[PDB]
């Protein structure tokens, strides 16, 4: 996926942030 | 003999809470924060460090900046802004320990890019990915091995649930356990409906009850190994900006009653868990637990038990400050057992 | 031939109810003919039309004069007396009173409507003392036409009780714990203010607020063999409508998450249709605004450990869902009026 | 020979006032010895200590028994009577009543405290009818010891009036419009519920709610020259405390933003010190919680068009800053008993 | 024939625009055939359907696969590339690009769409540099087919500019101050985080946040007569949608509130129909969700002083109203194509 | 309660008896003696006025309870 290949390079974008809380 | 030189990678809610925890506790510390790396600039991060919507205005000392450093009472913290830790100047800065607080390097391979940059150890302020030793202060940190170059301090919810689960398991023997954390929202949720790898975290945070999958369910089984695979649960993000409550329902082996459950945790809070668990019979609400330094505050009024063996306990925690207090504790602990 | 209805208390439930009946009026045995409330018809017609949660009412024109609210040419007489004994139910021929004030939920309190001339009272809340409680879908068929005062339980009880009945009949529930993470409601103070409950005193939109709930024990009222086996609490959170129940149970019969979901799913299509809705969608509370089901199971959240500790999570529009059940319970009563 | 004080209405203002005096107790000519309120002492002791906005009270321990709130060993006797006429002011030797219920803002209403034994009454809101209104820093030196019922006006008046006085004396205000973007207050409704104000009736944490502001008329009370020349409104918004007024003035002596800011800055360091604070920082409302000034001018937002159209923006903690002035006015009265 | 449209940036505006188009599709010269966004079609079909503000999409069924979003059998090809030059505009026969990422607002930035193959670009925000700005109902009839990159100004601009035009032509505007009390937007921070604007860096749902407004400059671009004569600011408040602008104008022809209202009202029923709506109801911000008008004048708040200081207050759904205008601007461009 | 509504009817009767017969009256003395008598019985589980107001005004903001 393009949005899956984008969250690989930039996990620190507010489109990918995952904080296991 | 000298002090451990610390850098903060990611000057966000945790990175800045941790900084203010250290700044307050600095009189007793084997640490010295000498560097920050963040996407933003020194002047902007100085502003945020001082003017916090949640902690109020910092007043223990003056806080300024120039193009290179932030200053907290004349104490200089050098500031660099590169998104790849590989490129960070940890070698020239003599960085002994890195607080990985960006949420972006929870894996050993990403977390050890700080080691390629010259760092000697790395404390991830989040559950680690893959086999990374995970520690909870007051439950498990005493098993820290000075040879660990990469550690995980856990999640906020894990630091709340784990001390309580340890007392309850030893008192009554936990067999299975469910958990639900009614959790303040956090920076990884979107302010208005926007793209996200978590379709629930994609939705407007201050507008919704948002169920997401927490790993505190998994983590607790790490720091208490005999409960691996015996606990599970979820999270419900709700429209408060800080302070969470965790609701734990457990099937125990030794019969008990709410009076006895409370007394156990109270006794723990005063002796073997002093400073980690706090015991409250007061009828308070979330706002009242802002800035609380405990990992868990048991809401003794909410304990209930059915049939002697199904136990319900509810604990508060300041997901930002409390978790930052433990991060600091864990870092000091590593500074004491440094090799 | 047609059961004349009056609403006592034109708050969030009185008005939701009113707007439920207005949309279900085509096939209805109820004619709302009068309103008692602390306020006036002009003020209450305005609220009726402009709802911050439900939006502008679109079906019919809402108007009012000195003594009447009019909805689509249908007149509703209004009075304003806080003692239901003074109310003109005899004059108005009120057959059914909807008791939506929250104040008259004991037998003696509610009975004042009967003294004023009403025949039956449907309390929109848990009853005090020995008032028969009903949840449409769980026990509303044991309703006895000779009952003059009834309780439609709480919103939470109407969400948990149907899920408890399905799970209990599938695997036999031995004990159960619930937490409802609940939108705030009118009994909480907007800012820290005097109250008999020290937690309800605190600012509702700023805080997570624990409060005692009885919906857990109240489930044992309608599923009488789980009496004394359920308990729970409430967490009030800063949302204005829609809540979610978290139910953790130990069951006799070993199962897994998938079976739990399939059971509830099959009930939602057959025995509990219209009452339970089954969802595998990854939604949030906003998406459930205006849902007509008492319970919406969030299938992605179901968990089971060791075969016997079951966890389920169910959404509900505490305002609008509960009101559909209030109307359902009334429509049923009008069916078996005796 | 202190001035014995009782608080009528232990609400947001009443408890901020109490905490204000507790911090300033050492230098005060006032002694708070009595409280009348809807609630009992234990509940009021709890709310005094645990405050969602101000946080937990730090300075001294707060206990309570059936009879009194205790502030670090200082006793405040408590009663619960909603009719001020029955209050034990005579027996308690009450000199000054801080009228903070909101529902005794007429002269006859507030005078019930005098029938009960008090000597003077300070209304923590605008008065209805001929009641001399005051703003510390604007006209409180025109207070006359013969005045036994006084108003300290509203929170917006206390923010706006000092900046208007400064502007007027420097450039000559000919006309002025105001809009306070205002944190909601206990007067509004958590969820849509009846209210004499059809907009304040609507769920406060959900809405921008346009409404009236006392400053519209009271600024002209304390600055008589400008009576009839000012007007405005309020937009209540979903924040629980801290507010900001936006004021646009038609002025006579043409100026520019630099000149306006220097004038207000100059006042804030001299004649208006402690009332106006001058700010060049890029802050937001949370940063002004607990700020003792009546007005914090946000200098960065000052703009002037055509030399004659002046726009200024001033923050204020409507709970804590206003209470600081209630204390100031009461101390002033304490200094001028006769 | 049909003007083939692509959406660049499937955000709040991009998805409101889609839902606008879908409701007006049966009468439209445009055909939305492509989407570019950082996210995938499945995520974006989920967002298009489930919307915290607009509710679940009713009109048509929405679905997706690896390649496209389907809105009732209508297939919208999706790509995910963040450099417009690499976008398949030429291969998709795209004519008009609705640029809604907020990052390509300069001419050279937006121009990348032209290199990729598109023929015109409509920026859903103010432009950077010489980019013609249009507001529908104020100056859009001046648009020229030769212009291929256009700005539709901000939401606040689209609300204030129709009213200024009326006020100006009726009374002659010499100067004007504006303050929009404004719901927060994606541009702000959920919790305190770094941001170019030190106040939009601060937790949006916690604070009143003063910031800039595009209407301060944009109104003067669409009403050239008034360039340099308007100014103002934005206060961002904790509501997710719907905003209100406060406009205080010094005018030349002396007037009174009744006359100000009667001029805007008649305009609203003639030359500004659909653009300005005149309201006398006592409503709050929730009630204007989904209004199709650019400005709703709140006549109850109109006030005037000394004949020359006029205060008007206008609501607008900054998401839905603004998107309706973007569609209008687009249809107009497809009408006058070249 | 009972003793309260008698202490107000005891000083109302003692102030009327005192004014009629004078201040030095033996009747006024017994009137205040009888009031002191019912105040010594009145003083010789601590329900609050708050709790009695919520019994009389159950629908007040200070008293609502919705069992949800
Ligand atoms: N806040 C909580 O509730 C909480 C509790 C326990 C644990 N945690 C953990 O703490 C971590 C941080 O969370 P937070 O709430 O501080 O989030 P945050 O968004 O406030 O912090 C992120 C900060 O890191 C910076 N950053 C992002 N990418 C970067 C990069 N590539 N290089 C350098 N800097 C970068 C950003 O500028 C931002 O300031 C998360 O992993 C979370 O799981 C959070
Ligand atoms: N919406 C929910 O959250 C919810 C869900 C399920 C059940 N309930 C129950 O329904 C009941 C109503 O709750 P609500 O949130 O609609 O309350 P509310 O406070 O919004 O409305 C109460 C109304 O009753 C009127 N009223 C009060 N005292 C009166 C009197 N003596 N005579 C006439 N009218 C009077 C008030 O004017 C007000 O309009 C409560 O008892 C609650 O327990 C509420
Ligand atoms: N809240 C503000 O920001 C602010 C600012 C300036 C002025 N004021 C004014 O101050 C006054 C107090 O308002 P508040 O915000 O504290 O509201 P509040 O509801 O928090 O306080 C009112 C208190 O008075 C009590 N009360 C009500 N009626 C009573 C009676 N008959 N007898 C005894 N006690 C009674 C209530 O129990 C409550 O504790 C209002 O008139 C308001 O206009 C408020
Ligand atoms: N929302 C309002 O109130 C409003 C009103 C009028 C005008 N506007 C303007 O409209 C614009 C859109 O704002 P919004 O509210 O939709 O924000 P948003 O964050 O909801 O939308 C931004 C979208 O664009 C995408 N995007 C960002 N950068 C990209 C890139 N380089 N390539 C491809 N896609 C990219 C993001 O994934 C996101 O989906 C803003 O510039 C704003 O100034 C907004």
Coordinates of C-alpha atoms in Angstrom, one line a residue, chain E:
Chain E
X1 CA -18.5 17.8 -22.0
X2 CA -17.7 16.9 -18.4
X3 CA -14.9 18.7 -16.6
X4 CA -12.8 15.9 -15.1
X5 CA -11.8 16.8 -11.5
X6 CA -9.1 15.5 -9.2
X7 CA -8.9 16.2 -5.5
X8 CA -5.4 16.8 -4.1
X9 CA -5.6 16.3 -0.3
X10 CA -8.5 14.2 1.0
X11 CA -8.8 16.2 4.2
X12 CA -11.7 18.0 5.9
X13 CA -12.1 20.2 2.9
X14 CA -11.4 17.5 0.3
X15 CA -14.0 15.2 1.8
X16 CA -16.6 17.9 2.6
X17 CA -16.2 18.9 -1.1
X18 CA -16.8 15.3 -2.2
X19 CA -19.9 15.0 -0.1
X20 CA -21.1 18.4 -1.5
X21 CA -20.5 17.2 -5.0
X22 CA -22.2 13.8 -4.4
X23 CA -25.3 15.6 -3.2
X24 CA -25.3 17.9 -6.2
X25 CA -24.0 15.4 -8.7
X26 CA -27.3 15.0 -10.6
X27 CA -27.0 18.7 -11.5
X28 CA -23.3 19.4 -12.1
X29 CA -20.9 20.1 -14.9
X30 CA -18.0 18.5 -12.9
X31 CA -17.0 14.8 -12.6
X32 CA -14.7 13.8 -9.8
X33 CA -12.6 11.0 -11.2
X34 CA -9.4 11.0 -9.2
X35 CA -8.0 11.5 -5.7
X36 CA -4.4 12.0 -4.5
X37 CA -3.7 11.7 -0.8
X38 CA -1.1 10.5 1.7
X39 CA -3.5 7.6 2.6
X40 CA -5.0 4.7 0.7
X41 CA -8.5 4.2 -0.8
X42 CA -9.7 1.9 2.0
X43 CA -8.8 4.3 4.8
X44 CA -10.3 7.2 2.8
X45 CA -13.5 5.5 1.9
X46 CA -13.9 4.8 5.6
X47 CA -13.3 8.4 6.4
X48 CA -15.6 9.6 3.6
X49 CA -18.5 7.5 5.1
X50 CA -18.0 7.9 8.8
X51 CA -17.6 11.6 9.8
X52 CA -17.7 12.8 13.4
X53 CA -19.2 16.1 12.2
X54 CA -21.3 15.3 9.1
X55 CA -22.5 11.9 10.4
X56 CA -22.7 8.7 8.3
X57 CA -23.1 9.5 4.6
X58 CA -26.7 8.6 3.7
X59 CA -27.2 9.4 0.0
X60 CA -25.1 6.8 -1.7
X61 CA -23.3 3.6 -0.7
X62 CA -19.5 4.0 -0.3
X63 CA -16.9 1.3 -0.8
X64 CA -13.3 0.7 -1.9
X65 CA -10.7 -1.7 -3.2
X66 CA -6.9 -1.4 -3.7
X67 CA -7.4 1.1 -6.5
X68 CA -10.5 3.2 -6.0
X69 CA -13.1 4.7 -3.8
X70 CA -16.6 3.9 -5.1
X71 CA -19.5 6.3 -4.3
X72 CA -22.6 4.5 -5.6
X73 CA -20.9 2.7 -8.5
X74 CA -19.0 5.9 -9.3
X75 CA -15.3 5.0 -9.4
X76 CA -12.7 7.5 -8.1
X77 CA -9.2 6.4 -9.0
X78 CA -6.8 6.9 -6.1
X79 CA -3.0 7.6 -6.1
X80 CA -0.7 8.4 -3.2
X81 CA 2.2 10.6 -4.2
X82 CA 3.3 13.7 -2.4
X83 CA 5.0 15.5 -5.3
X84 CA 2.3 16.7 -7.7
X85 CA 4.7 16.5 -10.6
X86 CA 4.6 12.6 -10.4
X87 CA 0.8 12.6 -10.4
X88 CA -1.0 10.8 -13.3
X89 CA -3.0 13.9 -14.3
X90 CA -2.2 13.6 -18.0
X91 CA -2.9 9.9 -18.0
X92 CA -6.2 10.4 -16.2
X93 CA -7.4 13.2 -18.5
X94 CA -7.7 15.4 -15.4
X95 CA -8.8 19.0 -16.3
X96 CA -9.3 20.8 -12.9
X97 CA -7.4 20.0 -9.7
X98 CA -9.0 20.9 -6.4
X99 CA -5.8 21.6 -4.4
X100 CA -6.7 21.1 -0.8
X101 CA -3.5 19.9 0.9
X102 CA -2.8 23.4 2.1
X103 CA 0.8 23.0 1.1
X104 CA 0.7 24.0 -2.6
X105 CA -0.7 27.5 -2.3
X106 CA 2.0 29.5 -4.2
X107 CA 1.8 29.7 -7.9
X108 CA 4.9 27.5 -8.5
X109 CA 3.7 25.1 -5.9
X110 CA 0.3 24.7 -7.4
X111 CA 1.9 24.8 -10.9
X112 CA 3.3 21.3 -10.4
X113 CA -0.2 20.1 -11.1
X114 CA 0.0 21.7 -14.5
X115 CA 3.3 20.0 -15.3
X116 CA 1.7 16.7 -14.2
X117 CA -1.0 17.3 -16.9
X118 CA -3.9 19.1 -15.3
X119 CA -5.2 22.3 -17.0
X120 CA -6.4 24.5 -14.0
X121 CA -6.0 24.5 -10.3
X122 CA -8.4 25.7 -7.6
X123 CA -6.7 26.3 -4.3
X124 CA -9.0 25.8 -1.3
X125 CA -7.2 28.5 0.7
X126 CA -5.6 32.0 0.2
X127 CA -2.8 32.0 -2.4
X128 CA 0.8 33.0 -1.9
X129 CA 1.7 35.7 -4.4
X130 CA -0.1 36.9 -7.4
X131 CA -2.8 34.3 -7.6
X132 CA -6.3 35.7 -8.4
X133 CA -8.6 35.3 -5.3
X134 CA -12.4 34.9 -5.8
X135 CA -15.3 34.7 -3.3
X136 CA -18.5 33.5 -4.8
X137 CA -21.2 36.2 -4.7
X138 CA -18.6 39.1 -4.3
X139 CA -16.2 39.0 -7.2
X140 CA -16.3 35.6 -8.9
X141 CA -18.1 37.0 -11.9
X142 CA -14.8 38.7 -12.7
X143 CA -13.1 35.4 -13.2
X144 CA -11.4 35.0 -16.6
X145 CA -11.0 31.7 -18.5
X146 CA -7.4 32.6 -19.1
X147 CA -6.5 32.2 -15.4
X148 CA -5.6 28.6 -14.6
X149 CA -4.5 28.9 -10.9
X150 CA -7.1 30.5 -8.6
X151 CA -7.7 30.9 -4.9
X152 CA -11.1 30.6 -3.2
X153 CA -9.9 32.5 -0.1
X154 CA -10.4 31.3 3.5
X155 CA -13.6 30.3 5.2
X156 CA -13.7 33.5 7.3
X157 CA -13.1 35.5 4.1
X158 CA -16.1 33.8 2.4
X159 CA -18.3 34.7 5.4
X160 CA -17.3 38.3 5.9
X161 CA -16.8 39.4 2.3
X162 CA -20.5 39.1 1.3
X163 CA -21.5 41.2 4.3
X164 CA -18.8 43.8 3.8
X165 CA -19.9 44.2 0.2
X166 CA -23.5 44.9 1.2
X167 CA -22.5 47.2 4.1
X168 CA -20.0 49.0 1.9
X169 CA -22.3 49.6 -1.0
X170 CA -25.2 50.7 1.4
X171 CA -23.2 52.8 3.9
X172 CA -19.7 53.2 2.7
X173 CA -17.0 51.4 4.7
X174 CA -14.0 53.6 5.7
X175 CA -12.4 51.2 8.3
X176 CA -13.3 47.8 9.8
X177 CA -12.1 45.5 12.6
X178 CA -12.8 41.8 12.5
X179 CA -12.5 39.0 15.0
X180 CA -13.6 35.5 14.1
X181 CA -14.4 33.3 17.1
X182 CA -13.4 30.2 15.3
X183 CA -13.6 26.4 15.8
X184 CA -10.2 24.8 15.8
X185 CA -8.9 23.0 12.6
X186 CA -6.4 20.3 11.7
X187 CA -3.7 23.0 11.6
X188 CA -3.8 23.2 15.4
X189 CA -2.2 20.9 17.9
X190 CA -4.2 18.4 19.9
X191 CA -1.7 18.8 22.8
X192 CA 1.1 21.3 23.2
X193 CA 3.5 20.5 20.3
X194 CA 5.8 22.5 18.1
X195 CA 4.3 24.7 15.4
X196 CA 5.4 27.7 13.4
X197 CA 2.7 29.7 15.3
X198 CA 3.5 29.5 19.0
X199 CA -0.2 29.8 19.9
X200 CA -1.5 27.2 17.4
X201 CA 1.1 25.0 19.1
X202 CA -1.1 24.9 22.2
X203 CA -3.7 22.2 23.0
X204 CA -6.7 23.3 20.8
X205 CA -9.5 21.7 22.8
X206 CA -8.1 23.2 26.1
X207 CA -7.5 26.9 25.1
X208 CA -8.8 30.0 23.6
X209 CA -6.1 30.6 21.0
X210 CA -5.6 34.0 19.3
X211 CA -4.1 33.7 15.9
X212 CA -4.3 35.2 12.4
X213 CA -7.2 35.2 10.0
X214 CA -6.9 35.2 6.2
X215 CA -9.9 37.5 6.0
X216 CA -7.9 40.4 7.3
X217 CA -6.1 40.5 3.9
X218 CA -8.3 38.5 1.6
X219 CA -11.5 40.7 1.9
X220 CA -9.4 43.6 0.4
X221 CA -8.4 41.4 -2.5
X222 CA -12.1 40.6 -3.4
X223 CA -13.3 44.1 -2.6
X224 CA -10.4 46.1 -4.0
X225 CA -12.0 49.4 -2.8
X226 CA -11.3 48.4 0.8
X227 CA -7.7 47.2 0.4
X228 CA -5.8 48.5 3.5
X229 CA -9.0 49.5 5.4
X230 CA -9.7 46.2 7.2
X231 CA -7.9 44.3 9.9
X232 CA -8.6 41.7 12.5
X233 CA -7.7 38.5 14.2
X234 CA -8.9 35.0 15.0
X235 CA -9.7 33.5 18.4
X236 CA -9.7 29.7 18.1
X237 CA -12.0 28.0 20.6
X238 CA -12.7 24.3 21.6
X239 CA -15.4 23.5 19.1
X240 CA -14.8 21.2 16.1
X241 CA -16.9 23.1 13.5
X242 CA -18.9 26.2 12.9
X243 CA -17.6 29.7 13.5
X244 CA -18.8 33.3 14.0
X245 CA -17.2 36.6 12.8
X246 CA -17.5 39.8 14.7
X247 CA -17.2 42.9 12.4
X248 CA -17.0 46.5 13.7
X249 CA -17.0 49.0 10.9
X250 CA -16.7 52.8 10.8
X251 CA -19.2 53.8 8.0
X252 CA -19.8 57.0 6.2
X253 CA -23.7 57.2 5.9
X254 CA -25.1 57.3 9.5
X255 CA -27.5 54.5 10.2
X256 CA -29.1 52.4 13.0
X257 CA -29.4 48.7 13.7
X258 CA -32.9 48.4 12.2
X259 CA -31.6 49.8 8.9
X260 CA -28.4 47.7 8.9
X261 CA -30.5 44.6 9.3
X262 CA -33.1 45.6 6.7
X263 CA -30.3 46.1 4.1
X264 CA -28.6 42.8 4.7
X265 CA -32.0 41.0 4.9
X266 CA -33.2 42.4 1.5
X267 CA -29.8 41.6 0.0
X268 CA -30.2 38.1 1.4
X269 CA -33.5 37.7 -0.5
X270 CA -32.3 39.1 -3.8
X271 CA -28.7 39.8 -4.9
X272 CA -27.1 37.6 -2.1
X273 CA -29.6 34.7 -2.1
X274 CA -27.8 31.5 -1.2
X275 CA -24.7 33.4 -0.1
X276 CA -26.0 35.5 2.8
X277 CA -28.9 34.2 5.0
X278 CA -30.8 36.4 7.4
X279 CA -31.7 34.9 10.8
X280 CA -33.7 36.3 13.7
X281 CA -33.7 33.1 15.7
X282 CA -31.9 32.8 19.0
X283 CA -29.6 30.0 18.0
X284 CA -26.2 28.7 19.0
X285 CA -23.3 27.3 16.9
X286 CA -24.5 23.7 16.8
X287 CA -27.6 24.8 15.0
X288 CA -25.7 25.9 11.9
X289 CA -24.0 22.6 11.1
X290 CA -24.5 21.9 7.4
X291 CA -25.8 25.3 6.5
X292 CA -25.2 26.0 2.8
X293 CA -25.0 29.8 3.2
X294 CA -21.6 31.6 3.3
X295 CA -22.8 33.9 6.1
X296 CA -25.9 33.8 8.4
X297 CA -26.5 37.2 9.8
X298 CA -27.5 37.1 13.5
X299 CA -29.8 40.1 13.4
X300 CA -30.4 40.0 17.2
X301 CA -26.8 41.0 17.7
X302 CA -26.6 43.9 15.3
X303 CA -25.9 47.2 17.1
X304 CA -24.8 50.7 16.1
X305 CA -23.4 53.7 18.0
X306 CA -23.4 57.4 17.1
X307 CA -24.6 56.3 13.6
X308 CA -21.1 55.5 12.3
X309 CA -20.0 52.5 14.4
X310 CA -21.7 49.4 13.2
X311 CA -21.4 45.9 14.7
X312 CA -22.6 42.8 12.9
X313 CA -22.2 39.1 13.8
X314 CA -22.4 36.3 11.2
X315 CA -22.2 32.5 11.6
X316 CA -20.7 30.1 9.1
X317 CA -20.0 26.4 8.9
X318 CA -16.4 26.8 8.1
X319 CA -16.2 23.3 6.6
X320 CA -19.5 22.7 4.9
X321 CA -20.3 26.3 3.8
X322 CA -16.8 26.9 2.6
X323 CA -16.9 23.6 0.6
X324 CA -20.2 24.5 -1.0
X325 CA -18.5 27.7 -2.3
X326 CA -15.5 25.7 -3.6
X327 CA -17.9 23.6 -5.6
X328 CA -19.6 26.8 -6.8
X329 CA -16.3 28.3 -7.9
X330 CA -15.5 25.0 -9.6
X331 CA -18.8 24.8 -11.5
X332 CA -18.3 28.5 -12.5
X333 CA -14.9 27.6 -13.8
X334 CA -16.2 24.7 -15.7
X335 CA -18.9 27.0 -17.2
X336 CA -16.4 29.6 -18.3
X337 CA -13.7 27.1 -19.4
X338 CA -10.7 27.8 -21.6

